[PDB]
From a paper:
The viral portal vertex consists of a 12-fold-symmetric dodecameric portal complex inserted into a 5-fold-symmetric capsid vertex, making it the unique vertex of an icosahedral viral capsid. Eleven vertices of the capsid are occupied by pentamers of gp24*24, whereas the unique twelfth vertex, the portal vertex to which the packaging motor or tail are attached, is occupied by the dodecameric portal protein, gp20. Early genetic studies showed that the portal dodecamer nucleates head assembly by interacting with the major capsid protein gp23 and the major scaffolding core protein gp22. Here, we report a high-resolution in situ structure of a symmetry-mismatched viral portal vertex from bacteriophage T4, which illuminates the key interactions at the interface of the 5-fold capsid and 12-fold portal.
Three cryo-EM reconstructions of the T4 portal region were calculated using different symmetries: a 12-fold-averaged reconstruction of the portal protein; a 5-fold-averaged reconstruction of the gp23* capsomers surrounding the portal; and an asymmetric reconstruction of the portal and surrounding capsomers, showing the portal-gp23* interface. Each gp20 subunit consists of a crown domain, a wing domain, a stem domain, and a clip domain. First, the 73-residue-long N-terminal portal region, which was missing in the recombinant portal structure but now fully resolved in the asymmetric in situ portal vertex reconstruction, is critical for attachment of the portal to the capsid (red). Although most of the in situ portal dodecamer structure obeys 12-fold symmetry, its periphery does not, as it morphs at the points of contact with the capsid subunits. In total, the gp20 dodecamer interacts with ten subunits of gp23*, two from each of the five gp23* capsomers that encircle the portal. The gp23* subunits strictly obey the 5-fold symmetry and show no significant conformational differences except at the N-fist regions (residues 66–91) which are disordered in the five D subunits because these N-fist regions now face the portal rather than a capsomer as in the rest of the capsid where they are stabilized by inter-capsomer interactions. In contrast, individual portal subunits undergo structural morphing and show large conformational differences in their N-terminal regions, Arg185-Glu204 hairpins, and Asp209-Lys227 loops. Our asymmetric reconstruction shows that the portal subunits form a series of salt bridges with the gp23* molecules.
Author numbering:
A (entry chain O): 2 to 380, 395 to 510
B (entry chain P): 1 to 380, 395 to 510
C (entry chain D): 262 to 313
D (entry chain D): 106 to 157
E (entry chain e): 92 to 521
F (entry chain d): 66 to 105
Amino acid sequence: KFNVLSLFAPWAKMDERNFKDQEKEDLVSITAPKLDDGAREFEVSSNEAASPYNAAFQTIFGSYEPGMKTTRELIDTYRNLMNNYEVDNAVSEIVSDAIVYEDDTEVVALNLDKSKFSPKIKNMMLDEFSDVLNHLSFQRKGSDHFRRWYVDSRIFFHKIIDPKRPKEGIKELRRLDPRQVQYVREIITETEAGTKIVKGYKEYFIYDTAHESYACDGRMYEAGTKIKIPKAAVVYAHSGLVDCCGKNIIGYLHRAVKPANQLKLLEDAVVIYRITRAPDRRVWYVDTGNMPARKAAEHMQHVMNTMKNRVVYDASTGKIKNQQHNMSMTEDYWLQRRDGKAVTEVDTLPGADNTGNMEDIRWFRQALYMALRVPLSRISITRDELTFAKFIRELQHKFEEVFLDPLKTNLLLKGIITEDEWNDEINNIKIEFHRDSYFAELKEAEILERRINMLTMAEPFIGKYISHRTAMKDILQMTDEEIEQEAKQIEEESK
Amino acid sequence: MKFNVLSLFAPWAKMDERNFKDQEKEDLVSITAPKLDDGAREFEVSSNEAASPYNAAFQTIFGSYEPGMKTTRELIDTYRNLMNNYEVDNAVSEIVSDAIVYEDDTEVVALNLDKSKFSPKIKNMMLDEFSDVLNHLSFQRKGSDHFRRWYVDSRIFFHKIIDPKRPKEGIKELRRLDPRQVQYVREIITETEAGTKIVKGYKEYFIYDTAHESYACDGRMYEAGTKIKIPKAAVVYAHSGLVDCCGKNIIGYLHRAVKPANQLKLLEDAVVIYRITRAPDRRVWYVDTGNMPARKAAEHMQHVMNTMKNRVVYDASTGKIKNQQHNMSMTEDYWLQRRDGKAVTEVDTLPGADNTGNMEDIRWFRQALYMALRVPLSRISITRDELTFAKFIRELQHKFEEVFLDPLKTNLLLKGIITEDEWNDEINNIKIEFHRDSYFAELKEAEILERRINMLTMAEPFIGKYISHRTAMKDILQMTDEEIEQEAKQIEEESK
Amino acid sequence: KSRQLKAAYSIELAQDLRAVHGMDADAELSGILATEIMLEINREVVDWINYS
Amino acid sequence: LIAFDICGVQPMNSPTGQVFALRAVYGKDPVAAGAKEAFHPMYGPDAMFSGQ
Amino acid sequence: GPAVMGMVRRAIPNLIAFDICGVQPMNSPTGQVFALRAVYGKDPVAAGAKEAFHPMYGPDAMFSGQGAAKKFPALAASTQTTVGDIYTHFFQETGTVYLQASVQVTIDAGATDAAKLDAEIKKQMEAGALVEIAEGMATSIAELQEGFNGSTDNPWNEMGFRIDKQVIEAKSRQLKAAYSIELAQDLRAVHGMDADAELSGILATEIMLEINREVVDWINYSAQVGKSGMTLTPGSKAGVFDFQDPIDIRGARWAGESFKALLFQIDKEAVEIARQTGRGEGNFIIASRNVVNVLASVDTGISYAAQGLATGFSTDTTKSVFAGVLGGKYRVYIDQYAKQDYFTVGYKGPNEMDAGIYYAPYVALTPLRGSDPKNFQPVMGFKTRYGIGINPFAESAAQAPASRIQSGMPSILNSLGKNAYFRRVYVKGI
Amino acid sequence: AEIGGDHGYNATNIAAGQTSGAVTQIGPAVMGMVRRAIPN
């Protein structure tokens, strides 16, 4: 091809190299897609005398595009769930715990405590990492980036390169708009009774242009075409959450969508029951029996436009509009009827009765609240708190790719580091982060108190049953080195 | 190998063929029922098989699929349908979390060769191979997902690979198989005087055969396609030993929760509609318009209908009543005219969404469900349920563990580090250990010690009379004699 | 407006094609028909452009 | 083939669907003999209509 | 439920599978087998070409020898021999024989068919008039072979071989059930039947039974008839073994000694088969249940005499069809559907291509399911395709086929009553 | 219809892969070959 989309020429080269590496792999005799999550794969089967990929093309084209449509419905819903009470806070609390940032604290930070080529590289990597965060304006908006990942289920960015001197002119990322990118995988290979090949898949992505106005959807249209761009150009990450099957990725709030809507529906039902029929209610009847409509209509008016009340509540000021004083001792009604029969009379209707016992609405509200992935302690430390800490850590960990990706990209292009080195280093180059230190300190303190309590009880037996070395490692949970260090420090302090 | 069918897997065919023949050589005979304890479906063949090539295998699959695995596929979909709901998925999360522990600055599931082996060099090779299995699976990051899927669908499967150019060092990354696509079987390759009880190497093969031509869920554009027959050696798998009353139609632990999972879902929705319905007002008008064709009567019906209809809604986006300004009247004045001589025209009201609960059955069922999902009752110190779940989990781990033992021996044996005979004698113990939550482990140990200290304290006044200190250490502190000497020796050192 | 085509083929043949060329060719028939229809449409569009 | 490269799609959700359009016209009569559009590209605007 | 007394149905008979024939699993239709025929006379493919090796024919003892120099006069009806000369004759069986004349006599001038001429020659041989003879070639002749020293017309006899082949094709068979919904529903309500599965069973069963029955019939169809020719007792009834006729039992009476007579003939027939195929003594017999009842009641080992109950070999056709092994030597199967009373014997080797009769499955028991929307009644059925064939050389009489190519499938011309691997015996008088 | 067709049971046509329908054949699989035993 002529690479008409010169926009990504350097990224295309990066994908070509990776694609070639896959072609040179021995990953054959594989019936499986070899995939777990992310980009949507399909049988674009080619490079064989059958050309079935044409059906695959036509399927994507002819059916454009329930994948992204569903994605929009889910995201739009996710936002609409977040818009209500409790969901709003659950998200906020989670986002805050995932990224805690305060005066003079630590940010997500690359911890290179594992073997590297040189300390010089360790510093280069950390400096680049800092710039990745600066590119993301992490210190100001890290929370927003995470929130979108959590809520919309995915985060993604466009990487920007020069392109004149692409390994040098490396620029900051452009956070991409949710619902605008389709991630895909193409099985471009075939063999005896179906492919059992490497299936490199390219794993590229396609950007759907859109220009919604006040539409709040692609009301008239989004913006025509979409551009196929090499995967090297996009940073992305997503939750480990899908529909029953496929690459039908969902957000963290998806699990709660059922009860979220049930609760809202129930709440609206409570309100409607309570407001409806609050006013007085009554229908006047008029006996116009054996009269033409031409006359009956006026005889009806003789009561209807005469016994009609004149009262409405002033909700700006709690007064009855134009009613002074405020209330009579009685409402005087009267009626004359043609005969001794209950035809021309007034029949009142049921009012806004009380029902709940708002226990059902509560049962659902409580189930929902917990369904938001939050502790039941909210509206010292228990198993749930520990669980949430693990949860938050995991969320941060999946999200983390958002830094590792642009990090390797820039480091590899500068080369600084090679691809082989990157692959050997990670493995583990984990990015650690600031956690709520208030609570962390409390945790550590309670653990220590317990350790002290155990030692205190042990005390009478130390010189007969439980030695020091043992007590320190078993009761106070000190390492061997820690034990020697504590002894040495004491010897110094003692002088 | 009568024909080189799917030569792609010839290395696996070689492994299975080898094993099949070795089984035939061995006197694995005089057995009444097929020697199959658990796992994949049974099928019988004639003496000297007379049931090959793979086309015969397809006969087996049809008979084993049409009335068989098709049901299994429904069960797999059911587990997903179960998990898709809340008050379900979280039980799984709790189980997965307990099953695989992830902690900072420590290890993850690891091979621990602390029992006799030929040499440390061999042990080190085994430890490296284990690590590569985890590396292949990115287990240290995705282990939770691998396990979760195993638990939830009651089965995990991974396709193994041999180069094959230089097959000696052939194991590379494992590939998870798509759920529902593959059936496994064990055929009885023998016949005698009505009811063979002799040796068969049972084939141990499997066939993949799905198509997106018929959807379980739309949006899918790839599948197995035709019937592909691959040797057992080619895969790694595990499942729980849970089956139905007959056959080999494997189910999960969560199967037990299907009943109440849906009873709860059903009750939840019933409750919602019970209360939502009739929340608005409700009224039916009856109009005495006779002696007219519908084309005329309709005018009179519209006269009333477009006058008495309170053409408003409740704005649920913003809590307001549409066009209702000012906010609320002190009354709603309605009117009707009658044409007959009797008070027949009227408007009836319907009873409304009142509240009759007593909303307690749903609570009972939810509790029953939560329990059904295999959870402790401590959830919405140390107790029996927690100890029980620690046991449930070590069994889940013990079974799951084959996911590592299998590719471990496979690559060790493939390279030649150890032999097959050695593996069988060595395990026994080639155990893989899972990390345990250090926080809770410390607490458990601390309580045990506290009790031990308290009992020692109580014994104290009688040590020089009735209870030797050696004995107290042995029974109260539960120490071995070597441990007692070690503590005495360390104390002597501390004192100096 | 609509379009439609059929395969109308022998099962026995498919059984043998698998044996002969490694081709079940049912997938092939599906691909052929699909290919032809989308191809026929593509041309249709081009001609409407030419016509208009 | 050239699948849709130079064409629109506007896929259906109903067979035999419908499209609409709106023309801006002048002279206070949406439908009239001799009626003209406010902005047709091949015809200049009537600068005197709003003027002398 | 007025005291339902359960129900009955017929049992399904067993099969002899392919225990006594080739199985040739196929992965394609229409396979092929070829063969090499050692041949001599300077043209491997020719009318009159002679094969170097054959189970029923003697070698040309003077081919590399004196026959290289000179032709020998042939024997023919009415001619007179000359004492001391050597005459040649190719017999219908026993092949090339060179006979020196001890006398000057004529041979059956009234002979017509070769069979009559062969018979008189055999008598002259028995009589000592004609004696088997061979010799090498005088060395003084050999000395100038290939035209040396001005000599002519002295080539050496040459040998070579001809490779040719035969092919097969698979024929098929299919059946449907064409059953109804209402019947199946009633059956569910009577016995708890699925009434599709039972039908599936029936159809698949019938197909398998037919195939196996077909193989047996092909065995009977191609087998040669025994108690004939070289295995014939001249005072016998030609192809049939009796118990009521002393000629077949060497005057026996007293079943303990009489029944053994059949075993004797069986060995003779099994041995002749080896003589016909060149591979080995027959190793399997299939016979009427009455024959087997006799075999199972006689001590088949070598002993003075002995008789008892039929306990030596399973005799039922209700559990199996395989009775057991006769003398530890032949696999005994029961022809559960024998039309009269008899028994076929034959030889099958360890080599799947060494069997005479071959079965070669390609497609089998493919189930089919659907329903006809006009009344929505179900349709179900099954399909099989395989093909069978015969051994090149099964006829054995001919040294080679026409045109270097033939169908490997049986036909009347190809094999009825001709197959070297099997022989028929009719049985009467039990 | 897309009938593969069949052979005429004519050995020539079988060997040559000639059929009556849409698809001709590559040719017959080799099932092996025969040589005769040598007399002892």
